[PDB]
Design a protein around this ligand. Sequence first.
Ligand SMILES: CC(=O)SCCNC(=O)CCNC(=O)[C@H](O)C(C)(C)COP(=O)(O)OP(=O)(O)OC[C@H]1O[C@@H](n2cnc3c(N)ncnc32)[C@H](O)[C@@H]1OP(=O)(O)O
Length: 210
Amino acid sequence: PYTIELIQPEDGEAVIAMLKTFFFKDDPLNTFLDLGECKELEKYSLKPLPDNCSYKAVNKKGEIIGVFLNGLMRRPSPDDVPEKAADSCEHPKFKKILSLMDHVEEQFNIFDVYPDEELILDGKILSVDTNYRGLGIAGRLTERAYEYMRENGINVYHVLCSSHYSARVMEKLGFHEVFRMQFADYKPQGEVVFKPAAPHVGIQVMAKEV
Ligand SMILES: CC(=O)SCCNC(=O)CCNC(=O)[C@H](O)C(C)(C)COP(=O)(O)OP(=O)(O)OC[C@H]1O[C@@H](n2cnc3c(N)ncnc32)[C@H](O)[C@@H]1OP(=O)(O)O
């Protein structure tokens, strides 16, 4: 028995406490790097909350057992000056993750796929408490976003997945791949950076039109 609720500003600390327990330690890239204390990821996670489209799964006792943090993304302006997220980061491990994200964006722009769309929903952080996994909570979090999308005329939900494991979950939920890159092929300075276990494979950007 759990509820799916909009994350409020006063929920920030509780969301961060939950993420520190699970996501910071068990996202495949975070665990590969042994991220440790990372105020940069805390900042990254809190950023989308004021967009009012992030959701928490809450058990009967009132504890957060899952979150899907989402933000609105807008088509780059005609006069856009693109920035690398990695430039303003002092945490060497998180900088590797941000550099990977920057690289993906250099190679693939979701807005090229959907020329008529100005605003797309971006699924930024998805995490479920270990003891509540395999119960469909990820799907129920995701489905709550469809409500927001309907209410606001948003057609596309975009989710960068850090492993084939999570991409498979999104596939089950009706998303399809729009871009992929193997970790073995990511060599920004000529050498492999990420070498997690073979089943992870690489990143996949997943999309659904709702
Ligand atoms: C944008 C981003 O954040 S990408 C990164 C996504 N987040 C992570 O990788 C963090 C670590 N992983 C997690 O927190 C979770 O595994 C999630 C969020 C990916 C999935 O959440 P869940 O609510 O468990 O999803 P779901 O119920 O669909 O289970 C997914 C699969 O996990 C497997 N599974 C079954 N039981 C368990 C369990 N006890 N523990 C873990 N996995 C299980 C199954 O393969 C299951 O698929 P199936 O039910 O269709 O057969």
